[PDB]
Write a protein that binds this ligand. Structure first.
Ligand SMILES: Nc1ncnc2c1ncn2[C@@H]1O[C@H](COP(=O)(O)OP(=O)(O)O)[C@@H](O)[C@H]1O
Ligand SMILES: Nc1ncnc2c1ncn2[C@@H]1O[C@H](COP(=O)(O)OP(=O)(O)O)[C@@H](O)[C@H]1O
Ligand SMILES: Nc1ncnc2c1ncn2[C@@H]1O[C@H](COP(=O)(O)OP(=O)(O)O)[C@@H](O)[C@H]1O
Ligand SMILES: Nc1ncnc2c1ncn2[C@@H]1O[C@H](COP(=O)(O)OP(=O)(O)O)[C@@H](O)[C@H]1O
Ligand SMILES: [Mg+2]
Ligand SMILES: [Mg+2]
Lengths: 96, 433, 438, 76, 445, 432
């Protein structure tokens, strides 16, 4: 997966040629977003203050007799997306 | 506080009858222009007319922007004042007319009464109730209360890592949960806990506070076009995948108009029509002017002040169409033109003295006369800009005031536009292009 | 070994070379000649250091090779790293991601630094013994004890659960010199006072030790956080803004966000929380800006958050980009009225020779007096940059023939091998039909 | 904090794109992009041409009685 | 590699040890002065002490400018980065031209990282704690080491490790008979499956069973990794491998080049300096070759001034075959090579001359040797005469059609008749232009 | 029946009509005349087939209607479908998504085919029983028509089986190396007579033979396809959507190295092909500058080009060049000139077109049509062929006569007559 990167793929072990090709120095020169957040924690705490003047929920579509399958389908889609993605959004909690 | 180019302008310097005092509020001349700007200020304060456009016309250095900022100072900080440059309509995200419309709506403000519901106390019980709700117990110095909250609030509490003994702040309107710290009563249990302690809240568990919020129509449009108030996954997805501005539709603006009218009818909102200022109007193109026709003809639009120093100049976006101010005659028919005049040497000396006082510079009378003579040629801007370098020279030589020698030295060190033009003409073969 | 920074065009410029009275020395800190221009640059530098007047603009104008960029680099080196210095080219503002006005605004706001100074309680000591007791199975409350030592103190600390977790994550052992911030609980290891046990295997080569800290354990240290206005704007624009600090991709930041940030920074300044450190924006080759960018500059310099703007251009009376209007320096007269112009005079023979000597000293090249005379004659006839390039070329040619000092023969050899603009144009005229167009 | 915009429309509008199954053809017979990551070259080229069912086999299996119960494992 | 390209015969600059250019060596013929200058430039690149130096190769088309640049690249070797680039590439729909130029500049600066990776391989035979006869605290059991036995093809070793590894062993679920590797520089245990000798033919696991490691239990090697500053910049601007929502968005969204900021580049520069000071890395400044520089517009040329004035920039080689042409992006501004005089003042110009008929014949012979083509002397002379008119490229491009025609005719060499027939079949630029002029009414536009 | 491929402008061309000596026949494989041009095309085709030399450029130049696209289609037909032949027009490189140089790079890498060859051991059978004890350890029973065995499962195999919801009666294959399970179908029993079936379920016969099998897959992909596959996580979707963007050069270099490694290992073979750009004069000067150095790579195909321009203006410049192409690129390419056709050649082409369209014409009709084609243009006569056939069928005729040709000549105008009629009423038309 990491094609053309200083970071090597997950070599199974020293038996694989990729194990002896990449260095830890190259790995430590690339910072993941979590490492960036850990690096800017004090800056985030001190300098992130701008709030939108107004806050609203998204516009809602209302019909007297909607197709009874649209709303449950949207609810299931939202539930699955939340169950898969909300744990991954926890690092941005202080920013939010 | 740093001293900017217009830091001395505090007002229009008008008397009670509307006539312009000679030197007042950091303004020296332009009596007719100042009286016209006072009339415009009264028009803005009337809050009756919509989409009335004013053009400040005159050569550069005649204080058009100074007059606009003086209008702003006369109005006050409550009345919105959106300063935009004509070059700012050329965005790579939205169309130019969208930028103009957004700047139009930014000028209309709304003072709205709001009530905030607050749950604040030390957590004594955090019991999930199976989607799982939460039953929470909060204590303050005045009492204790138990609350049942939505699962979203429970998720927020988990994200804040709220546990029994932590002091928390909950805003019921926005569902915003903030963990402030572990209660001070537990600060003695350990020696190294890696915690920030906070005293027990001294009010009630449940509080209601009424506050005045200052918002604009543009803020409502943005909030309803890129929503982030649901705290759901879809809002986060939309924010992350679509961060660019969008062309807000007329339907959304009509809905916002209806909402604001309903708020005003309910008595909880007050409208402040406000002012839009476009400085380099000649930098707009013909499409922007054509849009501004209809935009000014709107009954919702604010008061727009235009400025221009161009003479008979070609309108941008046209091939060779030339108009008196860079503005097509159709838009000039919709504006009231305020004319600014060139300054006399006496007015130049007055402005130089005012700028010196603003920058905290002591200047001798001989130096003031020499610098006014320097300003008679070249420009007033150059003469004003020589004050600080001359002050630095005087400070280096140990003098607390500027003498004529310092002004002469500075003028020798730094050239003006005309001197540089002469140098370029004399040495055209040595410079590039 | 060669660092990432090597000998460049202006590597010999360490400052403006002025005395206390801002009187330029003939040859100091790399600068030679340009006395009036260096004095003006020193006055502008004093104005920057005072940091009281916002939105001052200076134009360095002169013929090519007269030291405009040299003067700018000298100003940058004399300012120091404490004061922001954003140097960009005029071409850099033309971007497919943001508007020209947005790019100029970002350039301005990268040149103003906001500094927050606060005092925090800090524990720094040598770990003597750490004990952590945790339940064997299931969720439970970990209990621990930590012993820290200095040259004059030793305290045993009872640890809370979160400090226990922090110590476990950092893998703190005996002999590690650690720093603990009481508020946030952050732990930073800065060395080992001694080695680990030798009998252990798979440990690796032990590095050098660190002396144990002295003084009291819990000290109070001043922590300084410095960011620019642009960084605040970017991290406040959106949730993912901190990544935009490195990837660019900021788009166009809303004016509401910038107004809020300006208000908040003014509030901090009034409340004594933060100090504003205005810097310089240097736009090289400002003639590449179009009329819209200049018009934006006109009013953007009128803000109290604007930095000092320094421009360099080598244009005479030239067409303004985006228009059909001829103007001095390629700049509209409205912007030229808002700025002071510093002219650079051409260099004489002795100034050229001194510049060549400084360049040779920078490049560690030894040259004879006759070679200096010939090179100065070439520089006067052709250009200064051609002579500067011939310095290194002749150094390499001399080293090839196992020599030690660059002679006139080496300079002649590189003059034959490498051509200036004039001789190249002559040879191209001699074979005009062979070249493709015109 | 503002309440959201409640946009009301005719219930018939939400069924504008809806087409009854008896009025539309199966578009899965042209689904090429759906096969990616799920269908292999082996299945298309080697297996299915050899092991496609026939009507005769289907009829024989349907008509034939249930197969005898599978014998229990015996340690032999 | 097996296919023969236009510069497949250029193996470097044919320079003597004293720098003088041999008449024909290393695939290059003539151009002695340009080759000597390029050798001086090669020495400049190898010295690694100069930054931002620019060289312009100026001459008529078909005079070896690209061949000279590729000869320079051959002289430097694969260790030194060499980033070829045409001027048209700065026009991108994703990033600005200055960003493309800056990225290619950072692509030309390479970094070589040398590290020693020490690992312990083996199949876990023994897992025994080392208890202490005096338990601390009186109760329970205390352990001071954990003995791990590792077995490989040609040995077996026991390792007395820190007690803290018991948690890593339990997390990895390491038991006897499993193959693991422990890294010295980190002190972590990784279970790379179970040994294959304990697998039966009736098992269905795929990645669980692994062969017994060959070689010694203790393996250490020196890893040399070559990276460029642009690689680090790109890996940090759009990071890959995170498990947060931003990495998921990056994976989902279409990849797009972005305008990398000076903050990230300064951080990368600081990290590179730290690595160099630690001795881990060695800086390898290479060359950026910008062919067809005249295709750059005025903005690119203006940016190149600041780019070359930097102290981190590589040595840039330009090439232009234009005369007094009009600079792109400007209205009726003419400069000697299509390049503004400000950028020409910052470059050293190397002149390439036209080739005499003898040099053309030599180059044709070299190309025939490279393409595996046997050509008779009379055919070679005729083809050189064809090259005296027309151009050199036409003559070197008639070699393979003539060889094919000879092979069809049943001959192993090109004779004169084959060259004559090929010349009749294929037209050059001048003959085609004459045809077009003679029939300008019948053609379009 | 009517298939999707119908009678077009070059449906009659099946090849270049050459013998073993590349000597063009007068009328063979649907091509008439253009002997020198066809011989040159055959030489270029032999050069393509050898594949030794990289980045060779040929320009087919001539007057409109002289057979340039005819010769290109003949080359494409004569070249096997095995060898890639990417035919694009010059206007197709102006994209809103990627630069012109990126478009040309993608076309170049689309013109080189890579034939891969993977041999893999698999287990193939019908599932009889799946027993899992407790998600820790379990057994799987698989059978064929001639075999049956039981397997011990691990944690990952059990997880993969549960994820795919493999149950009894399913016919599955398992890759031994990677453990991935794909479901081929399910067996049919008396109890599986479903009334409604899912969109992916299908009933297949139980496999025969041995439970362990070797799978050999041979497919041809291009370099551009591998680039798009490895550009992003699900890059193969862009091979359908086309939302590729600008692929990083580092990815392309990595893929070039990997392809060389495969070629050395015997797992892949390179088939360099042809990129035909028709009407190249639409390319800008930047595109020509990129083409100059793109042809110099070792992974560059044969570039065949076709223009009908005289000395005209290069797009993006104000300069005049013999074909609209700058002379630097023209020095890199061999020019094949096409001559105008004679009366005999025009009549033979008309006969071939009539045979292709299944139209019977009298000899007088052929004479009249040849005269019209010489007077106006060959394409006008070709269109009149079908027009006259339709008119003849309308009057219930069987052979096209001179009257039908005259009728369609009066009904449909060529450019000259239409221009004359417009000049007669010039003021009526807009913007003269
Ligand atoms: N009547 C005035 N009194 C005091 N200062 C003035 C006056 N007119 C202009 N100035 C000062 O001179 C400078 C030029 O004013 P500005 O409004 O920018 O000119 P214009 O808008 O006509 O280009 C400003 O810094 C302003 O503060
Ligand atoms: N007064 C000076 N002192 C020292 N070096 C100089 C001086 N003037 C020019 N140089 C050097 O000459 C080279 C070219 O001058 P530069 O400043 O680039 O000219 P320009 O003003 O056209 O930018 C630079 O490397 C610079 O360091
Ligand atoms: N002096 C030379 N010796 C050998 N081969 C040459 C020489 N000069 C040019 N060539 C070859 O002839 C062809 C002409 O291309 P080239 O001269 O490199 O174009 P440009 O002049 O644009 O660099 C190239 O393939 C090159 O390999
Ligand atoms: N040698 C030929 N043999 C058969 N048909 C031809 C020949 N030359 C041209 N044609 C026909 O003439 C028509 C126009 O020629 P074509 O090659 O397509 O365009 P052009 O040559 O004008 O670029 C085509 O329909 C083609 O079938
Ligand atoms: Mg400069
Ligand atoms: Mg055609």
């Amino acid at each position: 997966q990491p094609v053309a990167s200083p970071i090597g793929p997950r070599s199974p072990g020293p038996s694989h040629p990729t194990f002896w090709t990449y260095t830890e120095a190259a790995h430590r020169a690339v910072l993941f977003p979590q490492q960036r957040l850990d690096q800017l924690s004090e800056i985030i705490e001190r300098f992130i203050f701008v709030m939108p003047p107004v806050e609203a929920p998204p516009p809602s579509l209302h019909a007297c007799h909607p197709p009874p399958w649209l709303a449950p389908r949207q609810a299931a889609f939202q539930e699955q997306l939340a169950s898969e993605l909300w744990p991954r959004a926890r690092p941005l909690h202080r920013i939010v | 506080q740093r001293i900017a180019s217009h830091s001395h302008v505090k007002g229009l310097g008008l008397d009670e009858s509307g006539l312009a005092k000679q030197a007042a509020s950091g303004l020296v001349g332009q009596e007719n222009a100042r009286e016209a700007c006072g009339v415009i200020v009264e028009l803005i304060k009337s809050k009756k007319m919509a989409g009335r456009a004013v053009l400040l016309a005159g050569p550069p250095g005649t204080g058009k922007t100074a007059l606009a900022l003086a209008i702003a100072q006369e109005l006050g900080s409550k009345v919105p004042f959106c300063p935009m440059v004509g070059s700012e309509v050329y965005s790579t995200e939205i169309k130019k007319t969208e930028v103009l419309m957004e700047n139009f709506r930014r000028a209309i403000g709304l003072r709205i009464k709001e009530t905030k519901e607050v749950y604040e106390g030390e957590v004594t019980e955090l019991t999930p109730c199976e989607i799982s709700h939460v039953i929470i117990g909060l204590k303050t110095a005045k009492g204790t209360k138990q609350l049942k909250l939505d699962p979203s609030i429970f998720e927020s509490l988990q994200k804040e890592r709220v546990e029994a003994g932590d002091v928390i702040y909950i805003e019921a309107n926005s569902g915003a949960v903030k963990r402030q710290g572990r209660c001070d009563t537990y600060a003695t249990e350990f020696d190294l806990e890696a915690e920030e302690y906070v005293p027990l809240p001294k009010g009630d568990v449940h509080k209601k506070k009424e506050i005045i919020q200052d918002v604009t129509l543009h803020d409502l449009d943005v909030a309803n076009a890129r929503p982030q108030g649901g705290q759901d996954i879809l809002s986060m997805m939309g924010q992350l995948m679509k961060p660019k501005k969008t062309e807000i539709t007329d339907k959304l603006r009509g809905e916002i108009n209806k909402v604001v009218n309903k708020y005003i009818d309910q008595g909880i909102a007050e409208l402040v029509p406000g002012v839009l200022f476009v400085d380099e109007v000649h930098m707009l193109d013909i499409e922007c002017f054509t849009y501004l026709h209809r935009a000014l003809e709107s009954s919702i639009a604010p008061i727009v002040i235009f400025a221009s120093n161009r003479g008979n100049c070609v309108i941008r976006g046209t091939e060779d169409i030339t108009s008196p101010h860079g503005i097509p005659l159709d838009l000039l028919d919709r504006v009231m033109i305020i004319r600014t005049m060139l300054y006399t040497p006496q007015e130049m000396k007055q402005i130089i003295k005012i700028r010196a006082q603003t920058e905290g510079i002591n200047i001798s009378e001989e130096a003031l006369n020499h610098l006014g003579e320097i300003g008679t040629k070249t420009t007033l801007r150059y003469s004003v800009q020589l004050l600080t370098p001359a002050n630095l020279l005087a400070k280096i030589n140990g003098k607390d005031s500027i003498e004529k020698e310092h002004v002469e030295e500075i003028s020798e060190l730094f050239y003006d536009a005309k001197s540089s033009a002469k140098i370029l003409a004399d040495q055209q073969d040595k410079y590039m292009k | 070994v060669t660092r990432i920074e090597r000998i460049g065009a202006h590597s010999h410029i360490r400052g403006l070379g002025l005395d206390d009275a801002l009187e330029p020395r003939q040859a100091s800190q790399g600068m030679v000649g340009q006395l009036a221009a260096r004095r003006a640059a020193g006055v502008v530098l004093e104005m920057i250091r005072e940091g009281k007047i916002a939105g001052r603009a200076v134009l360095i104008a002169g013929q090519p090779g007269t030291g405009k960029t040299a003067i700018a680099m000298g100003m940058a080196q004399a300012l120091g790293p404490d004061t922001p210095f954003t140097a960009i080219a005029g071409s850099e503002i033309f971007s497919l991601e943001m508007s020209k006005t947005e790019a100029l605004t970002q350039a301005f706001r990268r040149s103003i630094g906001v500094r927050i100074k606060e005092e925090t309680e800090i524990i720094e000591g040598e770990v003597v013994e750490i004990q952590i007791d945790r339940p064997a199975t299931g969720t439970g409350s970990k209990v621990g004890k930590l012993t820290l030592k200095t040259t004059e103190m030793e305290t045993i600390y009872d640890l809370g659960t979160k400090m226990i977790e922090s110590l476990t994550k950092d893998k703190v052992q005996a002999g590690d010199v650690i720093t603990i911030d009481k508020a946030t609980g952050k732990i930073s290891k800065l060395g080992r006072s001694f080695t680990r046990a030798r009998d252990y295997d798979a440990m690796g080569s032990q590095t050098k030790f660190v002396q144990c800290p002295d003084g009291e354990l819990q000290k109070r240290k001043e922590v300084v956080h410095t960011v620019s206005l642009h960084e605040i704007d970017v991290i406040n624009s959106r949730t993912q803004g901190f990544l935009a600090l490195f990837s660019g991709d900021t788009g166009e930041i809303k004016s509401e966000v910038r107004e809020q940030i300006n208000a908040k920074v003014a509030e901090w300044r009034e409340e004594g929380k933060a100090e504003i450190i205005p810097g310089v924006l240097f736009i090289d080759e400002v003639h590449m800006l179009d009329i819209e960018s200049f018009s934006f500059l006109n009013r953007a310099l009128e803000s109290d958050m604007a930095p000092v703007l320094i421009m360099a251009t080598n244009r005479g009376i030239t067409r303004i980009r985006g228009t059909s209007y001829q103007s001095p320096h390629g700049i509209p007269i409205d912007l030229l009225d808002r700025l002071l112009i510093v002219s650079t005079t051409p260099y004489s023979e002795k100034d050229t020779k001194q510049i060549l000597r400084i360049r040779c000293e920078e490049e560690d090249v030894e040259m004879s007096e006759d070679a200096y005379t010939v090179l100065t004659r070439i520089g006067l006839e052709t250009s200064l940059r051609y002579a500067i390039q011939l310095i290194t070329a002749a150094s390499l040619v001399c080293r090839k023939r196992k020599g030690t000092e660059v002679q006139v023969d080496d300079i002649k050899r590189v003059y034959s091998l490498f051509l200036d603009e004039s001789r190249s144009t002559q040879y191209m005229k001699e074979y005009q039909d062979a070249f493709l167009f015109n | 904090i503002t309440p959201g915009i409640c946009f009301s429309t005719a219930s018939l509008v939400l069924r504008a794109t809806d087409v009854h199954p008896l009025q539309r053809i199966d578009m899965g017979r042209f689904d090429l992009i759906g096969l990616e990551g799920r269908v292999s070259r082996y299945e298309a080229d080697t297996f299915l041409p050899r092991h496609r069912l026939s009507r005769r086999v289907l009829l024989e299996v349907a008509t034939a009685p249930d197969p005898p119960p599978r014998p229990k494992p015996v340690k032999m």
